[PDB]
């Protein structure tokens, strides 16, 4: 729908050690019919693929620093996500975000289409995806070009995301050429197996953002890029 | 209804860029005068997907019985919800190589001779009723290379795909 919204909670202070269980509201659009996704972004650095939940909660995905520490879980009736976090370690200091798959009648799965703003949590003391170049100086008006080259045949699998200043990320491409519903035109993407570009045919000045690639091809865990930022020259 | 699409374009991948060195490469079950490509278990969605389940059909003598298989929407739950098939007007049009890209023709003009029955077994000689069945005709006279598609790559359940199922069918000149 267009009134979409996941509200995460739980988040806070803790030490190694402790625990943490973050729930996330989900709003919008029919709960049961969606896998759900936690993903993170440790402070300055780019985004990761935490957890997954099947639509009816009977199949989870994790990555491997959260195997066996974190617990992904659903209540259908509640429409309400959970992260239990146990046995917390230094490296797990980051914004925890909750976010909805894109998968639908057998199709997307993998692709995160919609994230909440996140719950920071501070724990107080694989296909590989490379972005070129890491930073991007332009001018508005200018045709932006990112890059994403993956480490092996990722097929056309590729998502993009945009996140600007203090703002979740956004799905503007899937699976390499489709445009997201609601993305203005500039967005164009184009590529096959390793090699993938995102043009943005003329920048606005919102358009001045991070910029992450993802694949869904082989998974989990699903894998980003390091991100391309798009500054003003 | 016998047309073709002459602006449908393909490849043998698809959108799966898959390297044709990483096909799966099969020779079709022949009976002797029927020879099979049976899709029933080489699309179903796993974890490694998608791959490309290839069956080659070689032909070199008269009065051959082509037969291919390809799962319907619906005949397993889920397993092969976003099937499609290619051309969907088989097997009166079928797909052969412009350069790099895959163009729909009439297989009635590419081997004249050839016997298209509009039934097989009462049900319409069309993929939408699971299979197709064309026999070779006595005479080719030039070698001649077509294909199919059935696509189950497009079906996904979360981290598994579905295959894309390719037939080859390599008529070598026989009879003249």
Known sequence: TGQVQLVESGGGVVQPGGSLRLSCAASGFTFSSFAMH??????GKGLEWVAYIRYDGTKEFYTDSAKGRFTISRDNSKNTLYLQMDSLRAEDTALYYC???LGINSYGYGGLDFWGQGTLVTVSSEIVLTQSPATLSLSPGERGTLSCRASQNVNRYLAWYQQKPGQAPRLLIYDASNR????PARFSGSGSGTDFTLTISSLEPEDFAVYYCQQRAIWPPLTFGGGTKVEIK | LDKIDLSYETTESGDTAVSEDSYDKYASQNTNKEYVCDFTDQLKPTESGPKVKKCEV?????????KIICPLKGSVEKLYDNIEYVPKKSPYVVLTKEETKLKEK???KLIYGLLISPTVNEKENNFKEGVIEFTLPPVVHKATVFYFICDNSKTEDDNKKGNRGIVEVYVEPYGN
Do not use: F, H, M
């Open chain 2, 58 to 66: 070689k032909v070199n003598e008269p009065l051959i019985k082509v």
């Open chain 1, 38 to 43: 936690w993903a993170r972004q440790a402070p």
């Open chain 1, 99 to 101: 976010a909805k798959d």
């Open chain 2, 106 to 108: 009439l297989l009635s």
């Open chain 1, 180 to 183: 997201a519903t609601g993305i």
